[PDB]
RNA sequence: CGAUGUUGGAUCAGGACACCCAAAUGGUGCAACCGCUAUUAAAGGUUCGUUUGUUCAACGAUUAAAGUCCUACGUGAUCUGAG
RNA sequence: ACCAUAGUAGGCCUAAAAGCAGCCAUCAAUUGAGAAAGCGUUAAAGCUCAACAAAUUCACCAACAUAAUCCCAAAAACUAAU
């Protein structure tokens, strides 16, 4: 019988190796996670459907910004083979009121905060 | 439908014999030939 | 040195100019066509426009 | 085609995505007062 | 000449369909890209 | 080099080795650490059937192959020449390296077919009547398997079977 | 009908009315290879003897 | 000749040899150890 | 002119009573009224029990599963009791009398009606397990070689290895799969669900980690 | 199952070789003839009668041979109806 | 490739068991040869292996036919391919 897949929290412990090869921060982990649906949910089982949907992924190729809790995690590993997982990357800091009309999301990871000034 | 175990070596799925590809053992090749090597 | 088949890559060796003298050859084009747009020699303009 | 060039220089993967062929006005009038906006 | 016996992918004979570099590669690609997924999603 | 030269005078045959002058090798490999000639003169993954310079250094006058135990190289780079030379052979280079048949010259048979990259003996193959369809398919092969570890500026595998 | 523009010989023996048409000629998709009589000496001398073999030794 | 998968000599006089893209075991001796490799 | 080596020479080793094969029976004293479901998970995935030598220096390594009956087991008592020195040598069983029992029926009865009747009993083999294990005071050589045709006579495949042998294999397996090159391995995708291939896979794959296959085992993958 | 007409024969045969002859060979417990096996080769042939509806089967006379099959165990908008 | 002599027919049963239907011992001569690892005789005889003396490439297993209307895209081992 084909059941939900248990997954050992050996695979989530990280190398020393790693952080160097995918640019992260071994002290400080990120704050956001960018997340874009890469595959589709047809030919998958109603519950990774269900944790996509109730993750707001419906629309494929579209990043959405998540909490980096574990709450969110625990989703995020069960569809973890039909996303794509970025850290949000603050530049500039977080935009203002002042910059709401005026923010732009680059495909890097990154998040500017001026974007076309004049 | 076939049974678990058979006798005509029951020939996988795609996905899995692309699985078997992928996941194939590739011996350490080093760079220079230890043979005619000093 | 021996020379194989193999020995050298099946394809002519491309020589690059120098960094300087490509600047000097691009400002002296550049200069040359926007002399030709100053006198109006140009007789009729085609544009790829993005609309 | 060319997107992983593009996304290692930093672009979109499709020239359509916040670049400046698609954010700039495609328009304006000829008296160099601004058009009306886009709905895209 | 030669026939397939059944349907061409359901019967106890099937087609003998290989593998091919462009599917590996794109198992690879795939592979890393869940690599890094799970890399991020560990702290 | 030692050659056998016999002489008949009246009932008598002598028979005498004569030693003549032979090449050397460089006086510069640009690997002189390197045991093997190929392996220390960097011609390994290099050369191939149409490099006949270096597949005429060591091959008997009558096209025949050398003894490893009298050349030096490695087992593989001497199976891998042993193959290119019968490649070349088979393809029709190194015309002045056959036996020389005064008789056999003057009744002319079917003009030689040419070919390159030949495997097998061209009198030992039999044609492929069935041919095989897409899934079984009986590929024709082209090339010695022995020539897969060669270089490949372009990057592209070598199909030895087409 | 672009099997009926085809002109295929065996030997370069082509009737001079299709010799006054050709425009350009294509170059040949393969290199043909030398065989060892056809290297010069020169070159023959340029490339190095990999090996030395032995006086004592009959070919 | 005895038409065969597997070539094994039968006395010390057998040889093997490579002929017409087959093996074969020949004998003098014994005529009867001729064998091919089907 | 050659150097001497010296010869190993046998000691410890005693020869017991009666060094041939025992004597098998097709069916068991008591035998299986109730008839029974043919389970083939005593044939899919490794050896559990067999896996080691107990008394012997040779013995004979099945690589793949099977069922082993009356008639083999003749076979490899005969042959080995005929290419046996009882003078030099012992053997010993690793697998027990045929016990499973497997049901038939007769031809013409259409699908159905109830399970048939029992004809044979066989008895199940995984890979990996010994079943003819022999000492004394004899070299590997002529042991393997008479022993290489019981393994080629066997259904599943089989070889003639000694402690040394099995030794050497496995140290082998376990370099060759430390000393694998690409980072992606059949165990680690398994378990980490990789690509969702826990769809695609069996639950005995996270077992198996791809060497086993039904009854069949490849050493070469890892 | 708002029809795929069902055995044998008559006529016409197509094809495969896992060959009966005809052809080229090897080994033989092949001295010669009759033989026994092994390889390749399918352009061509593979009989006439009695009994049985018979396919098979048994018998008579021969032949170099009376080969095994597929073809809706070929062929009823060509035929025969004995079962 | 290189050659093969000595106690000796080692001792028992058998018409014969001389390395060889079988059982027990398995010593000892020449630097160098097993009461003999394969052929062979009714029994022998005789032919090979390993032992010295002559050199010394590498040398463990792995190869397997076929059906019927007519085979089945053609082709291509290197110009730079995440
Ligand atoms: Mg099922
Ligand atoms: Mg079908
Ligand atoms: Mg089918
Ligand atoms: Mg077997
Ligand atoms: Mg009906
Ligand atoms: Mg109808
Ligand atoms: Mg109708
Ligand atoms: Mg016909
Ligand atoms: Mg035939
Ligand atoms: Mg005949
Ligand atoms: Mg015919
Ligand atoms: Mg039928
Ligand atoms: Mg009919
Ligand atoms: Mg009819
Ligand atoms: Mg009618
Ligand atoms: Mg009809
Ligand atoms: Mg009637
Ligand atoms: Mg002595
Ligand atoms: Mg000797
Ligand atoms: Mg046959
Ligand atoms: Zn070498
Ligand atoms: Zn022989």
Partial sequence: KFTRSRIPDKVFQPSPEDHEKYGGDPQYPHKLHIVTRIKSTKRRPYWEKD???????????????????????????????????????????????????????????????????? | ???????????????????????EYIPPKPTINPRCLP | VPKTSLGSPPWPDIVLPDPVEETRHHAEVVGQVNELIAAGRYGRLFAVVHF | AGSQWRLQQGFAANPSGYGPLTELPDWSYADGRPAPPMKG | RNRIPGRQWIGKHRRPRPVSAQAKQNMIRRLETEAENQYWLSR | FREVVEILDGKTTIIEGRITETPQESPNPPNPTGQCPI?????????????????????????????????????????????????????????????????????????????????????????????????????????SPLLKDNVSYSGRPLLLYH | ??????????????????????????????????RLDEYTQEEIEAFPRVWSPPEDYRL | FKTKGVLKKRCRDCYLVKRRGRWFIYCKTNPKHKQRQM | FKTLLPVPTFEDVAIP???????????????????????????????????????????????????????????????????????????????????????????????????????????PVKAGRLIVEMGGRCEFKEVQGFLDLVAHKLPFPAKAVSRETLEKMRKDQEERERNNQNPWTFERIATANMLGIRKVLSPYDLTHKGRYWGKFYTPERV
């Fill in chain 6, 39 to 143: 392996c220390r003169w960097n011609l390994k993954h290099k050369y191939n059937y149409e490099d006949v310079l270096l597949l005429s250094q060591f091959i008997r006058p009558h096209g025949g192959m050398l003894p490893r135990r009298i050349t030096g190289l490695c087992q593989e780079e001497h199976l891998k020449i042993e193959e290119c030379v019968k490649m070349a052979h088979r393809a029709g280079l190194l015309p002045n390296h056959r036996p020389k048949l005064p008789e056999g010259f003057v009744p002319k048979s079917k003009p030689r077919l040419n070919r390159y990259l030949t495997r097998w003996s061209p009198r030992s193959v039999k044609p492929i009547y069935n041919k095989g369809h897409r899934w079984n398919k009986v590929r024709m092969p082209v090339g």
């Fill in chain 7, 1 to 34: 009908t672009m099997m009926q523009r085809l002109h295929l010989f065996p030997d370069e023996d082509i009737p001079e009315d299709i010799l006054k048409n050709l425009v350009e000629e294509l170059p040949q998709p393969r290199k043909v290879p030398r």
């Fill in chain 9, 17 to 123: 009573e009666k060094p041939k094969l025992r004597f098998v029976e097709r069916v068991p004293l008591v035998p299986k009224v109730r008839r029974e479901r043919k389970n083939l998970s005593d044939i899919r995935g490794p050896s559990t029990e067999a896996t080691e030598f107990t008394e012997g220096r040779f013995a004979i390594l099945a690589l793949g599963g099977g069922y082993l009956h009356w008639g083999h087991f003749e076979m490899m008592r005969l042959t080995i009791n005929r290419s046996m020195d009882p003078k030099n040598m012992f053997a010993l069983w690793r697998v027990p009398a045929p016990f499973k029992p497997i049901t038939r029926k007769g031809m013409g009865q259409r699908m159905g009606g109830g399970k048939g009747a029992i004809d044979h009993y066989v008895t």
């Fill in chain 1, 51 to 118: 944790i996509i949907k109730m993750l707001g992924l419906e629309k494929a190729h579209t990043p959405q910004v998540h909490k980096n809790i574990p709450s969110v995690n625990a989703k995020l590993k069960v569809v973890k083979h039909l996303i794509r997982i970025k850290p949000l990357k603050l530049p500039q800091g977080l935009p203002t009121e002042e910059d709401m009309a005026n923010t732009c999301l680059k495909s890097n990871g990154e998040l500017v905060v001026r974007w076309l000034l004049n």
């Fill in chain 2, 1 to 23: 439908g076939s049974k678990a175990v058979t006798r005509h070596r029951r020939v996988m799925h795609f996905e899995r014999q692309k699985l078997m590809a992928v996941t």
